[PDB]
Amino acid sequence: GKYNLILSEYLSFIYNSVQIPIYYSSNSELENRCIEFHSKCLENSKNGLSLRKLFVEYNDVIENATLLSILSYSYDKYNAVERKLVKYAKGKPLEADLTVNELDYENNKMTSELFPTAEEYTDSLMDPAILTSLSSNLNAVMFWLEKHENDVAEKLKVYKRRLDLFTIVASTINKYGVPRHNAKYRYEYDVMKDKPYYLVTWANSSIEMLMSVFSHDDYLIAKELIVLSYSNRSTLAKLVSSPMSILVALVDINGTFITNEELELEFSNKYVRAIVPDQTFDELNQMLDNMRKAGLVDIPKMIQDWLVDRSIEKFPLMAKIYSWSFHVGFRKQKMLDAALDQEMYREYTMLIRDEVVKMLEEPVKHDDHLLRDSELAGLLSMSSASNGESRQLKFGRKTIFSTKKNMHVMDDMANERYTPGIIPPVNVDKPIPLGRRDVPGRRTRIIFILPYEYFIAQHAVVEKMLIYAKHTREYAEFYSQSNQLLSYGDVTRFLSNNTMVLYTDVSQWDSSQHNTQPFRKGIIMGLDILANMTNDAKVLQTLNLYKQTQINLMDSYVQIPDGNVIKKIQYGAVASGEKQTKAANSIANLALIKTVLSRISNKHSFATKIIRVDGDDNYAVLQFNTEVTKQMIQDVSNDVRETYARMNAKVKALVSTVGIEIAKRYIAGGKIFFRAGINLLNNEKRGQSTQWDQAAILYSNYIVNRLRGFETDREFILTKIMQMTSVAITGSLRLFPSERVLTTNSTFKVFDSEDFIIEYGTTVDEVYIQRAFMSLSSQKSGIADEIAASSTFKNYVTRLSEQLLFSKNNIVSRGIALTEKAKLNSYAPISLEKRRAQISALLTMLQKPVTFKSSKITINDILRDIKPFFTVSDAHLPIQYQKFMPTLPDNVQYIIQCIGSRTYQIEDDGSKSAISRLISKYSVYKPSIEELYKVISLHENEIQLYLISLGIPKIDADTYVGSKIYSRDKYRILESYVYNLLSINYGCYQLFDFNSPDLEKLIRIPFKGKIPAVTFILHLYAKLEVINYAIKNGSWISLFCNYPKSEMIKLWKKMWNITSLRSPYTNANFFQE
RNA sequence: UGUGACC
């Protein structure tokens, strides 16, 4: 409940010259007492009278009623920031060292010096792209500095380390003033021309870093990064994190977890000697020197100290730096520079061609329907993103312009222009428009925004490839339902004194031009073989059109902006934007390592324990018939880089016997680590989400970092959420939502009152509000209705339906309509109509919570039903598992030491249900977990129709609707749907083994009948309650269940009428991965 | 309609 208190200290800090608490209650009498109180407060305020008396008079409302929101009548003029900052600006401002960055515009020159005129200006290279101001970040940091002014012992030392660093930011800002943002949180020319171009963005990164400082080591790290980053905006992060790829090969393995035959983590007390050739030490030194040459002092020393003994026990500091390096910010170059950098491949292409065959051989040979109706599949999968050009579009009786793909496909069909048979050119005549990918530390990469003919032509084939990968282990990122802990265990598995692991970053090869030929050619060569495997007109065309996208891209041309002009240049590299990007890249990176290993074999003899491709890295574990020596590693390493060299691939290739480091994960000393570098106060690009949506994403980002090892003070995050979630009524009237409003599991949830613990309403008031918010979940959009009524639209839906099903529709048809009415949301005009409505709705809600006919059941009610039938009792669980993920907080790690961990994702889509597999053998349709959920619960005769209506043959549609399987699917669907509503795959829970024998011990559930649905939810509700108590208390409890039999039937019914909830918190989790 | 692919 501490949020509602911290909220007032904040407003009482920001505004000084009133606050009007607004309460509400599910109880009539108490509510009028709330209504009355509100009034008297407004009135007294509108007379400068003390509210102290009303707070006593209505002591009842303050005690039993629920805080809904807080009114903020501040009559200043959004200033304060100006004044406030001076106190902290006593240090000497920083002076940009305009000689550190190559490209001139990467140096912190004065804005004007980069853009002499307002028409030449562009924030494109510094835009924080977030819906929160720099001004407020400042306010937030001082608010905290104040609150912890009079701290003691260690807490003070945290304040002192921060008071300093914040001076740097303050001193440097005051020298130019505080940049003022506009209605869209953008920094325009007038305000930026004076201050250094990168002032704002750098402020954001420094504040975000200093607020995540605790230990003296943090302070040392923040300090450096904050100072060097004011001048270096391009090599800092790569410099500060480059060493880590060598360090992993230094720490010895003294016990680690491995993967067993059941594909699960298991402890192995073994020892593996880290063998490092001297040459490696030189490389690591050159890296330490490079860091030094760039100003770096403190950080290099830390790695040097650690280098004396290299103890996995002191390694934590190395990982801390590795994660901090990213918080410097994103490297946003100019489209042109980003794009500018861009006989022995016989073996390499032969592999790409064969691998492409293995993945479609069966699908093709058996005239797979997916491949036949590939075009239709492409249409249902179509998104609402960009097609490239802004077309003029007429809908019904309205002429509007859009770039959306879903729009262009409709308008084009309604005019005979729809022609997926013809795959448009992407050469000099029709240059490829470009997109960009920005990341911290790495250089900017460009992206192709190809026309939809390309998606449709690739969709089906790519989905068949992803399936082959799903059950192929070399494809780490696609294999089974596996998470990263399984990949972690596969490496450590064969590590012994007679084997060495070989990791490799191939991100620079995929972008190379030397690659584009063997690539496309290898695929095409494969598509040919496949074509000579069938005679199916449908299959050969879908397979033919795919061959055409590869040929059109062999010689592509790109539209690179160069100021306010769009130069067209011939691009001879494989960029990315295709449907086959990830799959093809994986196929390629794998064919690569296979080629390298095969080559080096001629010299040395080894065994291939494992080969893996995962994103932009690939790796292998080799076994030798003798013991590995520092001289053997060197020899293998040289011949590997040398092999990569003869292919003209600029790639980083290292060799060790204990660790590996790749973009997604890194294994040091037998343990697993995940870079904690998600930026908080700066975003890659601007989307279309709301501030509320962004508040949730910030918190979501907070959580992931925190689990990964980088923690930002939770009071700072809470502060930010207060700013971002507020709503202005007028210019002096600002409304701030309460803890109950922002954390309750509703459609407006932003974060969990307690980290790592998701609560569900267990009080009438909580339920009250919960039902209210839903009442106004989805809002209308005029523009959306108009277009949802237009001919071109209805014909699209209709045309899609008539192609899919045979008999009647409705369940499916009502779906295709909506799925299409939603895609119109990417269209800003509609997006904006929606928000405006949400705000007014929410504006009147946090003013006097409306009514609601309820009648809708949510996972909340199900649980609130069960709760009362469980008896708690103190229990004890000893710690038995050793820590394998060192950065985890303590309360989360404890859980894992007691109950264990898992290496998989709990099926939450229902794809493993027989019915879903049936509909896949005959239909290109894909029902969601929520549709299968409603379907499976229909009367036997209705299911038989649905199936046959989608093309499922009677012998099969009938053999199912009765079989044991059907009855089963019923349970498995609901199981999948419920695991979905409980976020068993996100946050903290995704880590925990919910089938731990140790955990099962603490759950005593006597069967008083035998009805699966009820047995399931009771056990789950118990496992969650037990784990939550442990997450909050550090101790365990045992749960006993005495749930009646007469109740189990009432429940079972509720169970099948659950409604899913949509919210910022929910969408934040999906946005994660 | 300051917007910019695959996922």
Swiss-Prot record:
One of its GO terms (cellular component) is virion component. Interacts with VP3 (Potential). Interacts with VP2; this interaction activates VP1. Interacts with NSP5; this interaction is probably necessary for the formation of functional virus factories. Interacts with NSP2; this interaction is weak. It is found in: Virion. It comes from the Viruses. It comes from Rotavirus A (strain RVA/SA11-Patton/G3P[X]) (RV-A). This is RNA-directed RNA polymerase. Its EC number is 2.7.7.48. InterPro entries: DNA/RNA_pol_sf, RNA-dir_pol_4-hel_dom, RNA-dir_pol_luteovirus, RNA-dir_pol_reovirus, Rotavirus_VP1_C. It catalyses: RNA(n) + a ribonucleoside 5'-triphosphate = RNA(n+1) + diphosphate.
